[PDB]
Design a protein around this ligand. Structure first.
Ligand SMILES: *[C@@H]1O[C@H](CO)[C@@H](O)[C@H](O)[C@H]1NC(C)=O
Ligand SMILES: O=c1[nH]c(=O)c2[nH]c(=O)[nH]c2[nH]1
Length: 515
């Protein structure tokens, strides 16, 4: 096939502009996923209480600190209880002779009158709007799980639709669905409706993710294809910085969600000026359309050959593909072949670990460091050099040691985060950033390495199964935080154990760089 790209220009003005255009979309698409660090931030809260909040009642000369001690009991964390209040004001607790033994839990009641939230950092969040606290506290990670499950279902449905209707058409309606569903989520009236719209937004996120990469690869000559995949992967790196930059300015969740959604109307509008994949149009037996959209690109790249492209040349240049690209093999074949079964197991585990660890940690920055805006920005800034170093070492040291070393870097940093005491917040934050950097490097590493461990007929099958495994791991990511009742160390130990085991496992793979 690529002989045609050499008539049309296989790297040039069109591929440059297409890479820029799709990278920008991937940036905003990354903001959509990272948003719920900020849209769903948990502000500090307490029960509403008469002496503190009933401004219509008779006031007193006591200070707010004293009235808080008189109204809200202390909780386990040596801070005011987030889910209880005194049944009657505890005037007895003001005198210096008082002790903690002076009251008992029967003297307290739950927040009958609802909660009061700290508005200093964020003006509003979904947690503050729908009271996703105390007995409802599980509902935040449930919302994140529903989003990531939406992406799983969307990726499962994308394949058949992408193959039947085309890369660009599905990408176009994915952009429209992202805009519409993000705008709808921004104005949802109730929590179930918000979950429905976030699910339907994720369903389109999957389509954008898959089709952008597929279309970039299908329009790029082979010498530049790894570089193009790397640039498309740096799109997310800049997406992290963009998330921090936008969320630092917009402190209301409705306005923030709307702001990050609206750009996709423009993405929808400019996607119509992209060409549908020529490989797809030829494979589906539509030469008259493939010729048009090839010489359209030849016009952009500035070639005289737009006069030379002709149907007979177009047909003669792709004689093999239409005659042989007819093997949509089932996933089970990977397990049927004795040799490939165990390689498939290990590579699928390496895909799983990325999603599990990354969307375990990256979606609760509030636990990792002092300032989530700056920490998100750093998760971008450190992701970039990690990815470039991954590409280079992947090109020199071999895929096996680079995959193993990246995953072991991630695991060791995330585990060490549990050894460093809570007082050393700076080192905890730095280790968390480095761990997410290692995971993000392994993302590129595995994307390329899994495309070599299997014979060329089953290469694509392995990559698809790996992607589904990463999505299954991402879904479990958020739910693992529900173990945190037993301690803050436990979710971190789990998230750190997974990459350690998978990184050790990657050592058992064969090397695929030339030896
Ligand atoms: C708040 O104060 C007003 C003052 O008139 C009173 O009528 C009302 O019952 C009070 N409510 C609570 C919950 O203290
Ligand atoms: O390096 C990444 N950063 C992300 O924020 C992200 N989100 C995603 O779905 N895949 C990736 N990869």
């Amino acid at each position: 096939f690529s002989e045609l790209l050499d008539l049309v220009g296989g790297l040039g003005r069109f591929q440059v502009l297409q890479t820029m255009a799709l990278m920008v979309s991937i940036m905003w698409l990354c903001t959509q996923s990272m948003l719920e660090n900020f849209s769903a931030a948990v502000p500090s809260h307490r029960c509403w209480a008469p002496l503190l909040d009933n401004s219509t009642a008779v006031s007193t000369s006591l200070s707010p600190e004293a009235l808080l001690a008189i109204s809200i009991p202390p909780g386990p964390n040596q801070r005011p209880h987030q889910c209880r209040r005194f049944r009657q004001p505890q005037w007895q607790l003001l005198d210096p002779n008082a002790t903690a033994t002076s009251w008992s839990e029967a003297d307290t009641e739950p927040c009958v009158d609802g909660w009061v939230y700290d508005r200093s950092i964020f003006t509003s969040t979904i947690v503050a709007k729908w009271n996703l606290v105390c007995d409802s506290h599980a509902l935040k990670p449930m919302a994140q799980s529903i989003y990531l499950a939406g992406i799983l279902v969307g990726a499962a449905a994308c394949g058949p639709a992408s193959d039947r209707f085309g890369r660009r058409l599905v990408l176009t309606w994915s952009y429209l669905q992202m805009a519409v569903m993000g705008t709808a989520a921004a104005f949802a009236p109730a929590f179930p409706v918000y979950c429905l719209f976030r699910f339907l937004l994720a369903f389109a996120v999957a389509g954008v993710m898959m089709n952008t990469g597929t279309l970039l690869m299908e329009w790029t000559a082979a010498r530049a294809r790894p570089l193009v995949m790397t640039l498309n992967s740096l799109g997310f790196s800049f997406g992290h910085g963009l998330t921090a930059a936008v969320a630092y300015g917009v402190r209301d969740w409705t306005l923030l969600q709307l702001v990050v959604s609206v750009p996709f109307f423009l993405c929808f509008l400019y996607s119509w000026w992209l060409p549908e994949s020529a490989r797809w149009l030829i494979i589906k037996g539509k030469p008259d359309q493939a010729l048009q959209e090839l010489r359209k690109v030849a016009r952009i790249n500035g070639h005289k050959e737009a006069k030379n492209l002709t149907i007979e040349v177009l047909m003669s240049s792709v004689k093999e593909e239409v005659a042989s690209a007819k093997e949509p093999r089932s996933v089970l074949d990977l397990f049927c072949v004795p040799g490939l079964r165990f390689r498939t197991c290990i590579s699928t585990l390496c895909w799983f670990a990325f999603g599990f660890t990354f969307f375990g940690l990256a979606l609760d920055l509030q636990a990792l460091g002092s300032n989530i805006f700056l920490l998100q920005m750093f998760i971008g800034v450190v992701d970039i050099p990690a990815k470039m170093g991954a590409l280079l070492l992947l090109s020199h040291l071999g895929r096996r040691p680079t995959l193993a070393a990246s995953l072991l870097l991630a695991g060791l940093c995330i585990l060490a985060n549990t050894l460093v005491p809570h007082e050393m917040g700076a080192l905890r934050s730095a280790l968390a950033v480095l761990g997410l950097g290692g995971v993000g490097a392994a993302f590129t590493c595995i994307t390329i390495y899994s495309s070599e461990l299997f014979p060329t007929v089953l290469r694509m099958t392995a990559v698809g199964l790996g992607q589904m495994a990463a999505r299954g791991g991402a879904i479990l990511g958020p739910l693992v935080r529900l173990l945190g009742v037993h301690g803050p160390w436990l979710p971190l130990l789990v998230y750190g154990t997974v990459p350690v085991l998978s990184g050790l496992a990657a050592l058992l793979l064969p090397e695929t760089q030339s030896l």
